[PDB]
Amino acid sequence: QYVRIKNWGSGEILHDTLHHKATSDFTSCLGSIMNPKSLTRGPRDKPTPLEELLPHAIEFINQYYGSFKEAKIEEHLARLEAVTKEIETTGTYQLTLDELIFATKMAWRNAPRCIGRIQWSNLQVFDARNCSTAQEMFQHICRHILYATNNGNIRSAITVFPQRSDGKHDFRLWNSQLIRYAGYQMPDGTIRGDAATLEFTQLCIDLGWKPRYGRFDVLPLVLQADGQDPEVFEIPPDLVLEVTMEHPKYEWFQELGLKWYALPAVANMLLEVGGLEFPACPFNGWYMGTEIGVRDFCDTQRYNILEEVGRRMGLETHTLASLWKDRAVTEINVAVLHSFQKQNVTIMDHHTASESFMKHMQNEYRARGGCPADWIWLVPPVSGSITPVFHQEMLNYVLSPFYYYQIEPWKTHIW
Amino acid sequence: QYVRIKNWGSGEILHDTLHHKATSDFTSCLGSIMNPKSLTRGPRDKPTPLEELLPHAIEFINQYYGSFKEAKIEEHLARLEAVTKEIETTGTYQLTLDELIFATKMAWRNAPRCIGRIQWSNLQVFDARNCSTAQEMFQHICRHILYATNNGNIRSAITVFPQRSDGKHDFRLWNSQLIRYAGYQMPDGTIRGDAATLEFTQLCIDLGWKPRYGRFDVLPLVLQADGQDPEVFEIPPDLVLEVTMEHPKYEWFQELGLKWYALPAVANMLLEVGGLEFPACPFNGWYMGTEIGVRDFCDTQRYNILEEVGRRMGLETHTLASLWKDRAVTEINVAVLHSFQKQNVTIMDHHTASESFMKHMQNEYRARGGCPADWIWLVPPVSGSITPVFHQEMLNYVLSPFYYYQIEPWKTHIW
Numbered sequence A, B: 001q002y003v004r005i006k007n008w009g010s011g012e013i014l015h016d017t018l019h020h021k022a023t024s025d026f027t028s029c030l031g032s033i034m035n036p037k038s039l040t041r042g043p044r045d046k047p048t049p050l051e052e053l054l055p056h057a058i059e060f061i062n063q064y065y066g067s068f069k070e071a072k073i074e075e076h077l078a079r080l081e082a083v084t085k086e087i088e089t090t091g092t093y094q095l096t097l098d099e100l101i102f103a104t105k106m107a108w109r110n111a112p113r114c115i116g117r118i119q120w121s122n123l124q125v126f127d128a129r130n131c132s133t134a135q136e137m138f139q140h141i142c143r144h145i146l147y148a149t150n151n152g153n154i155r156s157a158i159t160v161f162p163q164r165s166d167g168k169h170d171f172r173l174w175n176s177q178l179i180r181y182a183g184y185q186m187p188d189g190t191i192r193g194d195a196a197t198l199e200f201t202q203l204c205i206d207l208g209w210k211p212r213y214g215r216f217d218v219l220p221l222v223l224q225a226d227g228q229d230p231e232v233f234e235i236p237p238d239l240v241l242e243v244t245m246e247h248p249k250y251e252w253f254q255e256l257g258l259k260w261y262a263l264p265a266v267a268n269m270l271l272e273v274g275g276l277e278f279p280a281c282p283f284n285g286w287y288m289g290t291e292i293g294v295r296d297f298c299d300t301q302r303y304n305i306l307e308e309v310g311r312r313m314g315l316e317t318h319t320l321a322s323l324w325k326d327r328a329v330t331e332i333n334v335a336v337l338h339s340f341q342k343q344n345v346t347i348m349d350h351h352t353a354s355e356s357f358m359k360h361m362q363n364e365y366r367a368r369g370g371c372p373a374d375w376i377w378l379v380p381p382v383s384g385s386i387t388p389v390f391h392q393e394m395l396n397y398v399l400s401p402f403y404y405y406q407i408e409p410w411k412t413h414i415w
């Protein structure tokens, strides 16, 4: 009928009907889309039809064993054997810890939108597949956070909860990411904190969470175990490391009173592997300066500090042609970079990050002739062509294992 | 078998075999590709099979008449009538000047990679469909250049040459764009001028053109009429307007001795309309600062002036983390912007350009529910998310009329 298109800046939606008048086979490309269904793995009422599960399981087990040098044919056949048996006896199966570890790295390895993949093999894996209660999820999450934070020297880690069984016993973190500041609709009409979390904030308020009406209040974990309703757990403040923003030259920068958390951790994605699905497996890497400096601090729909930094710098805030924005954003970026460095908190600039990826990609093509890459996400939000990845053509395809997006829980979940 | 992937920075090529292990239907996306076959319209040995031509012609004629308010049904039917007749009598047909004008604007209108489309209706159209000789093409081109340049106050224009008949009587400009600086492989091993034109430069040398071994030597027009070999015509220097680069603060900027031409004009694209094809129809708009400031002056494979500007600014050229590149590029951009303004030569900054497009797109959706847009090209090479189009999701599809790319002539042409 038509295609929905959204502008994440103004929120506005548009209906496209023109593509119907398109020509032959051009490569309606849905690449500019944030959350396309092709990248989402949703709900389920019943187990995974054995006819499907078994083949995938086999492939996976073949990938795993085909991995290490100097094969283990016997172990391989036996595993292939043991796995089939377990499936026709249980209607599913359990991966060996090693398979898990292998799975999570390869999934990371196949994340087309991840620019830090040269680190793919460095990943701590916490096995919480035996978790059973919400409170137990909380403890696990707290442990993850403490380990990954490591007092500023960030470590990449992922904690894997129980796999989806029937489809109505899903463990799931309702949060987008582990640490995230709340956004409130103030009474005077203004918005305080992160405007991007307005709804989810309300959701937490609706679940009995007490708002602190601040600019940087760390939201609570909203966990749901097995299938039960979600329970709210506040994050122990001693566990949330932060960096206060300051510029190495403009002493008025700190007057802005900005800061950001040091831990970037995905909370709501799904890990598909060998037919198995893990609807709850939070993971983290470390930050790239521009995420905070450009996206978090300069997006219109976020903290939007660009004009304020402009005026303070004495720029011509009323003349786009003056390129005052290009100037301000660069200083905000140096502040972020500077502040993290001064406080000994791992971070990387987008230039070294870009080169890093290029080396990864070339290593990746040699080792296995390819590397799924989504240019639209790999090119930084500033200084695009000043970066190597901008001039690199790339193919974006979905392999397996893979980290998928999922439909927001509060939408498809009955209490 | 595999897909070829190129890095326009190092020139290196890579073969991708992994996509074969892809999953279901994700939206191997070939969006990161510069010149995909889907966007190219190539050669032909014989006329256009009437079975194909006729239907397209009808559609087009229906688009044209369905255009203006208060229809002209009689004229429409008659035109539909007259056109069919002409086709079964000639094996082709001629568009009325108006249809041409309508065609070229709609083609511009359907250019997914053009950011200046809010200007789509402002286009001067020179009708050279009666051209017959190379020298005649030259005169026409000179006229175009003089009109468009307009002493700095740039005007958008397109000159349409004779349509492809049999397929072996193609009028074609061998140049990428009308004005373009030559790049020479110097004897001492270094490269002078625009390294991007090294081959084409050689081609001109091979055609009897005398190299001037400079940094900014305007290359000659290499025209081919009907089907004959290409003839070389040098461009009258009085016709090539230039802007010498200078910074509004660093007086040493001009010491760099940089300059660029004021006229951005496409020379090698094809105009498809109603089954008809025009393999030669150069057109021009005006510049967006970043094209010169970022691409032309800072690409590694181009003039590559980034480090030099860095040192002169006193930056930490040996520490990526210092973000010295983000600083230099911004000053280069202001120089370009400043220099064009000071010399009264039309130009637009990428911010006003970005807003301009957003307004176009919204107007476009209301008027005809859609606007083909290629995000990868619409987002500037710097300050991406500081721009509105970065947050706008968009669909990229090929309509008609349309401006296609073509296979480089020197590859498929016999002397």
Ligand code: HEM
Pocket: A104, A107, A108, A111, A113, A114, A115, A116, A117, A119, A123, A156, A157, A158, A266, A283, A284, A285, A286, A287, A288, A291, A377, A403
């Ligand atoms: C070692 C440090 C790492 C760095 C520097 C890094 C950096 C990044 C950055 C900059 C993005 C873009 C975020 C955005 O634009 O919103 C991203 C996306 C992504 N990363 Fe990484 N990453 C790292 C580790 C990991 C790990 C350990 C995993 C998983 C095991 C991972 C999985 C992903 C996925 C799936 C995405 C896409 C997320 C989405 O679509 O929202 N990354 N990463």
Ligand code: HEM
Pocket: B104, B107, B108, B111, B113, B114, B115, B116, B117, B119, B123, B156, B157, B158, B266, B283, B284, B285, B286, B287, B288, B291, B377, B403
């Ligand atoms: C009024 C001024 C105009 C401006 C400001 C403008 C600007 C631009 C810019 C900045 C690009 C990107 C170039 C690059 O990244 O290499 C572009 C591409 C394009 N423009 Fe426009 N344009 C204008 C007029 C036109 C006109 C008059 C036509 C045709 C009738 C046109 C057709 C196209 C096409 C086909 C492309 C894609 C070219 C390619 O794929 O290489 N533009 N334009």
Ligand SMILES: CCN1c2c(F)ccc(F)c2C(N)=NC12CCN(C(=O)C1=CN=C(C#N)CC1)CC2
Pocket: A177, A179, A180, A196, A263, A264, A265, A266, A283, A284, A285, A286, A287, A288, A291, A296
């Ligand atoms: C997911 C992408 N992403 C990563 C990831 F998957 C894995 C490992 C990482 F190190 C990162 C990272 N370096 N940033 C985020 C994106 C920024 N994110 C946030 O906290 C967000 C803050 N505000 C947002 C908004 N609107 C979105 C995300 C942290 C994870």
Ligand SMILES: CCN1c2c(F)ccc(F)c2C(N)=NC12CCN(C(=O)C1=CN=C(C#N)CC1)CC2
Pocket: B177, B179, B180, B196, B263, B264, B265, B266, B283, B284, B285, B286, B287, B288, B291, B296
């Ligand atoms: C085509 C895209 N393009 C336009 C276009 F189609 C139509 C109208 C325009 F105003 C522009 C424009 N504003 N720049 C170029 C791209 C830059 N180009 C050049 O001269 C190039 C210089 N160096 C290059 C390299 N390598 C490529 C192009 C001028 C036309």
Ligand SMILES: C[C@H](O)[C@H](O)[C@@H]1CNc2nc(N)[nH]c(=O)c2N1
Pocket: A008, A031, A032, A033, A034, A376, A377, A378, B390, B391, B392, B393
């Ligand atoms: C609409 C557009 O896809 C979206 O705003 C962008 C594009 N590319 C991105 N790139 C990264 N790395 N992260 C993002 O959030 C986005 N968002």
Ligand SMILES: C[C@H](O)[C@H](O)[C@@H]1CNc2nc(N)[nH]c(=O)c2N1
Pocket: A390, A391, A392, A393, B008, B031, B032, B033, B034, B376, B377, B378
């Ligand atoms: C490989 C990549 O597609 C290429 O280097 C880019 C991307 N987007 C672009 N965007 C514009 N406007 N112009 C360009 O030359 C390019 N080139």
